[PDB]
């Protein structure tokens, strides 16, 4: 359970912008928040042109990811503070991605981009450009990302943890982040991610937490899969999930729905 060490306070942060060795960076869709206005001295990363591969559907290797790294001047000892809006979800995507690709020291700011402008922290508008680094990923850790052939496996054998709206689990409607078919993998759990969430962006306490997901039926004895469309809801849920309630064995399913809704032969469950 390791909320002290991933996660930091607006009020943290704002005392600390220009800390030795510390970054700030926003996540998001598109960078149009942040060149409106932004952290002061935060530099951004877009969601889809910086952190997806451009033909393939995946995200970025490690070598794209330290050469991305480098040209942002982002260094390995650095500590990476993310920070975003559409509710810090791309921001914990990002954290995700920091931690496939082993970096140490990152933590989100707690509310994000919402959290911060509702406490009526500054902004910025100036420009930033940081001396380029240079950045080198470790190979991908797997054990935190599930892929098609694992997750068909892990049907009745992990938690597998649907964080979509209850209309689109139980199937009632299907859904770019389309499938061939509407429903659930059999044996899914359906907390939707922003139930793990407070109003102002937060992340809900480790009591709220730990019983929101034992009552809607997470098994201590199995190992845990988290999935959505993409993986974005699902990203922020694996967080809570592994970094915030410290389940060691948790994976987070990019392919999601629109891979596993299209694929031919596939299970599907429906309604609850």
């Given at each position: 359970?390791?909320?002290?060490?991933?996660?930091?306070?607006?009020?943290?942060?704002?005392?600390?912008?220009?800390?030795?060795?510390?970054?700030?960076?926003?996540?998001?869709?598109?960078?149009?928040?942040?060149?409106?206005?932004?952290?002061?001295?935060?530099?951004?990363?877009?969601?889809?042109?910086?952190?997806?591969?451009?033909?393939?559907?995946?995200?970025?290797?490690?070598?794209?990811?330290?050469?991305?790294?480098?040209?942002?001047?982002?260094?390995?000892?650095?500590?990476?503070?993310?920070?975003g809006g559409n509710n810090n979800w791309f921001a914990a995507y990002a954290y995700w991605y920091?931690?496939?690709?082993?970096?140490?020291?990152?933590?989100?700011?707690?509310?994000?981009?919402?959290?911060?402008?509702?406490?009526?922290?500054?902004?910025?508008?100036?420009?930033?450009?940081?001396?380029?680094?240079?950045?080198?990923?470790?190979?991908?850790?797997?054990?935190?990302?599930?892929?098609?052939?694992?997750?068909?496996?892990?049907?009745?054998?992990?938690?597998?943890?649907?964080?979509?709206?209850?209309?689109?689990?139980?199937?009632?409607?299907?859904?770019?982040?389309?499938?061939?078919?509407?429903?659930?993998?059999?044996?899914?759990?359906?907390?939707?991610?922003?139930?793990?969430?407070?109003?102002?962006?937060?992340?809900?306490?480790?009591?709220?937490?730990?019983?929101?997901?034992?009552?809607?039926?997470?098994?201590?004895?199995?190992?845990?899969?988290?999935?959505?469309?993409?993986?974005?809801?699902?990203?922020?849920?694996?967080?809570?999930?592994?970094?915030?309630?410290?389940?060691?064995?948790?994976?987070?399913?990019?392919?999601?729905?629109?891979?596993?809704?299209?694929?031919?032969?596939?299970?599907?469950?429906?309604?609850?």
């Amino acid at each position: 359970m390791a909320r002290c060490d991933v996660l930091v306070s607006a009020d943290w942060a704002e005392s600390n912008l220009h800390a030795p060795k510390v970054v700030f960076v926003e996540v998001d869709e598109d960078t149009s928040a942040y060149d409106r206005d932004h952290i002061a001295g935060a530099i951004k990363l877009d969601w889809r042109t910086d952190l997806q591969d451009p033909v393939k559907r995946d995200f970025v290797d490690a070598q794209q990811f330290s050469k991305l790294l480098s040209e942002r001047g982002i260094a390995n000892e650095d500590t990476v503070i993310l920070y975003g809006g559409n509710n810090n979800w791309f921001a914990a995507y990002a954290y995700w991605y920091f931690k496939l690709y082993g970096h140490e020291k990152v933590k989100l700011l707690d509310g994000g981009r919402k959290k911060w402008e509702l406490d009526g922290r500054p902004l910025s508008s100036d420009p930033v450009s940081r001396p380029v680094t240079s950045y080198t990923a470790s190979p991908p850790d797997n054990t935190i990302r599930a892929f098609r052939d694992e997750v068909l496996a892990a049907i009745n054998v992990k938690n597998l943890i649907d964080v979509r709206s209850p209309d689109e689990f139980s199937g009632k409607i299907l859904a770019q982040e389309q499938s061939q078919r509407p429903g659930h993998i059999p044996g899914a759990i359906n907390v939707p991610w922003s139930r793990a969430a407070n109003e102002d962006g937060t992340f809900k306490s480790d009591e709220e937490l730990a019983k929101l997901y034992a009552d809607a039926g997470l098994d201590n004895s199995k190992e845990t899969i988290a999935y959505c469309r993409i993986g974005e809801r699902s990203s922020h849920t694996w967080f809570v999930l592994r970094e915030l309630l410290g389940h060691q064995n948790v994976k987070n399913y990019d392919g999601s729905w629109t891979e596993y809704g299209s694929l031919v032969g596939a299970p599907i469950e429906l309604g609850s």
